[PDB]
Design an enzyme around this catalytic site. Sequence first.
Site, mmCIF file in Angstrom:
data_model
loop_
_atom_site.group_PDB
_atom_site.id
_atom_site.type_symbol
_atom_site.label_atom_id
_atom_site.label_comp_id
_atom_site.label_asym_id
_atom_site.label_seq_id
_atom_site.Cartn_x
_atom_site.Cartn_y
_atom_site.Cartn_z
ATOM 1 N N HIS A 147 -26.983 15.027 -76.295
ATOM 2 C CA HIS A 147 -27.309 16.191 -75.818
ATOM 3 C C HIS A 147 -27.570 17.340 -77.759
ATOM 4 O O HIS A 147 -26.673 16.262 -78.797
ATOM 5 C CB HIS A 147 -25.570 17.401 -76.082
ATOM 6 C CG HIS A 147 -25.511 18.232 -75.800
ATOM 7 N ND1 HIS A 147 -25.964 19.595 -75.888
ATOM 8 C CD2 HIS A 147 -25.493 18.972 -74.206
ATOM 9 C CE1 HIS A 147 -26.159 20.250 -75.828
ATOM 10 N NE2 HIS A 147 -25.553 20.671 -73.890
ATOM 11 N N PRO A 148 -28.188 18.027 -78.085
ATOM 12 C CA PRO A 148 -28.944 17.559 -79.541
ATOM 13 C C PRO A 148 -28.280 19.637 -80.057
ATOM 14 O O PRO A 148 -27.974 20.364 -80.751
ATOM 15 C CB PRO A 148 -30.032 18.186 -79.036
ATOM 16 C CG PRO A 148 -30.283 19.392 -77.778
ATOM 17 C CD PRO A 148 -29.178 17.904 -76.379
ATOM 18 N N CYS A 149 -26.958 20.437 -79.268
ATOM 19 C CA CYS A 149 -26.283 21.358 -79.137
ATOM 20 C C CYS A 149 -25.053 21.378 -78.737
ATOM 21 O O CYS A 149 -24.338 22.586 -78.907
ATOM 22 C CB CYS A 149 -26.873 22.859 -78.706
ATOM 23 S SG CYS A 149 -26.790 24.113 -78.913
ATOM 24 N N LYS A 150 -24.141 20.246 -79.196
ATOM 25 C CA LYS A 150 -22.869 20.358 -79.257
ATOM 26 C C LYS A 150 -22.203 21.095 -80.034
ATOM 27 O O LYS A 150 -20.748 21.503 -80.397
ATOM 28 C CB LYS A 150 -22.339 19.170 -78.407
ATOM 29 C CG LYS A 150 -22.807 18.104 -77.521
ATOM 30 C CD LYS A 150 -22.355 19.094 -75.848
ATOM 31 C CE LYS A 150 -21.644 19.640 -75.624
ATOM 32 N NZ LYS A 150 -20.497 20.040 -74.159
#
Length: 213
Positions: A147-150
């Site tokens: 995931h790139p946006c946690k």
Amino acid sequence: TFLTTGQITPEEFVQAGDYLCHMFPTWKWNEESSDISYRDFLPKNKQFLIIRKVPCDKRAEQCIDDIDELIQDMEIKMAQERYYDLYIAYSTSYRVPKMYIVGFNSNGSPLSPEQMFEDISADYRTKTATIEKLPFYKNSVLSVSIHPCKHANVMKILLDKVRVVRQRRRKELQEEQELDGVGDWDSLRVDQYLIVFLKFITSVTPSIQHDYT
């Protein structure tokens, strides 16, 4: 726009997907199968992207300008050997793409979750990767999702860095033209979103062959 937020809509996901499959024939949209759990906000034949059996020679332990160059160039146009299937799906909670990898050994035997983490760069594990079933199949399989946006809005950071580099390069160019007295002699589109996304992925899984770039 996506340059301000670093986030996209399912329609932008589709354009970017199409661009990705067009520039890299190895990537493909999902076929329409009965085992897929369809999402109405996306065309049935454009739910997720898949690239098969990307080779992995070494583990992760061993192992910005490039992106810009690549993007520009495109605008012009242990010992065990492993193989990973890579899926790119759209995440509705963050309006960003999300990757899912499923590893295998030469015999086609699925690698356990613990084994796959050996291929996730230690510097990205905790806030980027976790274990989860592919969300687009009815009877699913285990995988490691990236995931790139946690935490940090990775896409946003990367797109900004790319624009900064371009702005600097563009002004450095005009400055050199005035200096050399030759002054009298490319924007970022949503189409290239996933290519920037893959740059991110490359840092997260450094031992996975760049057969997708």
